[PDB]
Design a protein around this ligand. Structure first.
Ligand SMILES: [Cu+2]
Ligand SMILES: [Cu+2]
Ligand SMILES: [Cu+2]
Ligand SMILES: [Cu+2]
Ligand SMILES: [Cu+2]
Ligand SMILES: [Cu+2]
Ligand SMILES: [Cu+2]
Ligand SMILES: [Cu+2]
Ligand SMILES: [Cu+2]
Lengths: 272, 270, 276
C-alpha cells in the first residue's frame, strides 16, 4: 500500500463544457484515469479553477465524510479554492465475525457533486467525470485502457456520430471502463467481442458460472469494465460499439473499436 | 423447517393510501417485514378491511395457484373478506438426475395484485407492498433491517425530500432490503458503503467473482438486499443513499444512513 | 465441431411486418430458433426477398466483418440478393497468457441491422429477430424451448393481450429464451418459478453464488435464458409471465405458462359453465 499524491484541476473548457485535468489547461472529458492497488491511499490536491463551486466524489473507494465532496458534508470547493481529497482502499480479508470483507478492487468513477445542483447534475452534464480502476494483487494488466461514458445521449460528451474511436492491434489485451451518467438507461453493446458479467470482466476458470454477454443494461452512475483479446476469433476490422436502444444508436450513440492487423492495415469500412 | 401463522390486514390510510399491517390500525408502508428460514411454511390469515377487492401476491416463495392472489386464479379477497394464503419455502438440494435445485432463500417482497387493475397497479401505487426475507442455514443475521422501496418517484411513499433516514452505530451489521415498483427504472446508490451483487450482498469468500458495487440499476418488482458493517473503513457520518438518476435525486429521492460514533454523536452535517 | 448449412429468407409479412423463415412463404416472428454446440460452424445462405436492403447480425457468436450485416462493413444484402453469412463458435479454454477464454455458449439472438436505419430500427420493429442458443458440452437439454421477445410494448409482435401462452406438464424441463428489443426497458417476471441469474439459469451446485430471481430488468438487445422444472414445488396451474412495469402489464405484456397435472388438467381452469 503506497501513499500517493496527484494534483487535479476542474477547468471550464473553451467550448461550453467542464473537465478535470492533471495540469492547468490540460483538462479532458472524461477526466484522467486514476489507477490504484488495493491498500493504496491517494491524496488528490484538487484546485477548482472555475467561478462556481465544484467538488470531487468517488464511488466504491473508502473515504471519510470530509471527502464526500458534498454540501451535506461541507466538502465541496469554493470558486478558485483548493482542497485535499483523500481516497483509501483495502484488500479483501476475513473478519473476526467469520464473514468475508470485500476488497476495494473494481471499475469505479469520480464526478462532481455540486455544479448546477446539489447532485452535480450540471457538472456531470458538462463533463466533470472520470474513471478509477482499483486492481487486486494478481489481476491481469492490459496493453491499453479506454474509457467509454454514456452521459445522457452523448458518448464522452462527443457530438452525435463523432466517436470516440479506439485503435488496437489484433491480439492486444484491451481494457474498457464503461460508466453511465445522467437521466437515461442505456444498453452497452460491442460487435465481435464479449465479456463476463463479473468483477473483472473475465471468467476465473471453467467453474465460473457468470453470464458471458455482449450487451448490458446500465443506468446513471453504474460502472463496469472488462478486458478482451482484440479481434480474438473474429479478426481485424472496424468493430462498432453502441448503445443498443434503437433511437439512441440512430441519434449517434455509436463509436468504433478499430482493430488493425500487425501490418497496421484494416478491412475497408464506411463510417457514418 | 417450522409451520408459522400470522394475521395480516389491508387497510386504507390517509391521502387515499393503502397499507398492510400485522394488527388492525397498525398498517404501514412498506408493510411488515416477514422473515422465514428455508423449509418454513407460513399461513397468512388475511383480512381485507377495505371496500374494494384486494389480494396478496408474493415473489420467490413456493405457493400453489390458490395463493397466487390474482383474479386469474380466483384468489383475491372480496371487500371485508378473509382468506388464508400459504407460502412454503425449500432448502437447495440435488435432484435425482444430479441437477441442483435452487433454494427459496433471497430478498423477496409481497404486494397487491387486484387494486386499480388486474396487476395491482393502484394497490402498489397506494402502498400495498412489503418485504420478505428467506434465510438459508448459516446465514449471518444482522443487528437491524431497513426496507427502502422506490415506488415510482417516492421512497416508501413519503413526500419528496423527506427520508426515510436510518440510524446505526459504527460497526453495527446493518441489512438493507431494496424493492422497486411502478413505472420507472432507478439506480440505487449508497455513499461510503458497497456490497456484492449476489444473494446476500456479501462475497462467499475468496473465490466468489461477483461484482462489488455501490450503485445498481433496478426496475419494477426487482428486489435485492445486502448487509454492511456501518462505517467500515469510512467512519461515522451522514451517508446519503439516493437514486442516482439525476432528475430523481434533484427531485428528492434521497435519504440518510446516519452512522453515529459509539458516544452517539455524528460529524456535523447539512 | 460440425459444419452446418441452412437457408434463411427475409420476407415481407402482412400488415407491414417482416420476418425470417427457413423456406419462402414460411417466415415467422420470432424467426427460427438456431441451435449449435460450441465448436460448430454455421453457414447461412441468406436471401433477401424484400424491396429494401436487409441483413443478419448475430450477438455473441464469432463472425468476421464480412458477416457483420452492417452498412459500415458493407455486409448487408440488396433487394432480391443472396449472401452467405458464416457464424463460428468455440469452446472455452486456457490462453497462453494464463487467462480463461470465455466460450461461445449462451442465449443469444440475431436480427436485421439495415431496414429503416443503419441500426435496423425499422427491421427489428417489423419482426426481423430470432433466437440462437449455443450449448456447451454436458449442458442439460430441455423437453421444450419457448422464445419470448419483448419488442417495444409487444410480445413477439403479437397484438396486446394476445399471449403467447406455452403449455407443459408438471415435471417437464422447460427452457425459456428471453430477448428484448426497441426503445424501452422492461422487467421480466414469472409467477411460481424462479431461476439463477447466470449463463444457464441453473445453479451449478452449492458453491454457485449467483442470484436466484423471479424478476429481471432487461433493455434493448439483452438476451438471457433459463430452464425450470415446470410446477416444481408449486403444482399445476395457469402461471402468468409478464413485464412487471405496471402500465406495460396493464396494456397487455402478459402471457400464460399453462402447467397441466400429469392427468392432463389445469387447476382452476373452467372455460365453460356447468348446468345447476
Ligand atoms: Cu451522491
Ligand atoms: Cu442509450
Ligand atoms: Cu455518484
Ligand atoms: Cu404478477
Ligand atoms: Cu430514480
Ligand atoms: Cu409481482
Ligand atoms: Cu449493432
Ligand atoms: Cu415492459
Ligand atoms: Cu444487435
Amino acid at each position: 500500500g503506497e501513499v500517493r499524491r496527484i494534483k487535479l484541476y476542474a477547468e471550464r473548457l473553451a467550448d461550453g463544457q467542464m473537465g478535470y485535468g492533471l495540469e492547468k489547461g490540460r483538462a479532458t472529458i472524461p477526466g484522467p484515469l486514476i489507477e490504484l492497488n488495493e491498500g493504496d491511499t491517494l491524496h488528490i490536491e484538487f484546485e477548482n479553477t472555475m467561478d462556481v463551486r465544484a467538488s470531487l466524489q468517488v464511488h466504491g473507494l473508502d473515504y471519510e465524510v470530509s471527502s464526500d465532496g458534498t454540501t451535506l458534508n461541507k466538502s465541496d470547493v469554493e470558486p478558485g479554492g483548493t482542497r485535499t481529497y483523500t481516497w483509501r482502499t483495502h484488500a479483501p480479508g476475513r473478519r473476526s465475525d467469520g464473514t468475508w470483507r470485500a476488497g476495494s478492487a473494481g471499475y469505479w468513477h469520480y464526478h462532481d457533486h455540486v455544479v448546477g445542483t446539489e447532485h452535480g447534475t450540471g457538472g456531470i452534464r458538462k463533463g466533470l467525470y472520470g474513471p478509477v480502476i482499483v486492481r487486486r494483487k494478481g489481476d491481469v494488466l492490459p496493453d491499453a485502457t479506454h474509457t467509454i461514458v454514456f452521459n445522457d445521449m452523448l458518448i464522452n460528451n462527443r457530438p452525435a456520430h463523432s466517436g470516440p474511436n479506439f485503435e488496437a492491434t489484433v491480439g492486444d489485451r484491451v481494457e474498457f471502463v464503461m460508466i453511465t451518467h445522467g437521466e437515461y438507461y442505456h444498453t452497452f453493446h460491442m460487435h465481435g467481442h464479449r465479456w463476463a458479467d463479473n468483477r473483472t470482466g473475465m471468467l476465473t476458470g471453467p467453474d465460473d458460472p457468470s453470464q458471458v454477454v455482449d450487451n448490458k443494461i446500465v443506468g446513471p452512475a453504474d460502472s463496469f469494465g472488462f478486458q478482451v483479446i482484440a479481434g480474438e476469433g473474429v479478426g481485424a476490422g472496424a468493430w462498432m460499439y453502441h448503445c443498443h436502444v434503437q433511437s439512441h444508436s440512430d441519434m449517434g450513440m455509436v463509436g468504433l473499436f478499430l482493430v488493425k492487423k500487425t501490418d497496421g492495415t484494416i478491412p475497408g469500412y464506411e463510417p457514418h
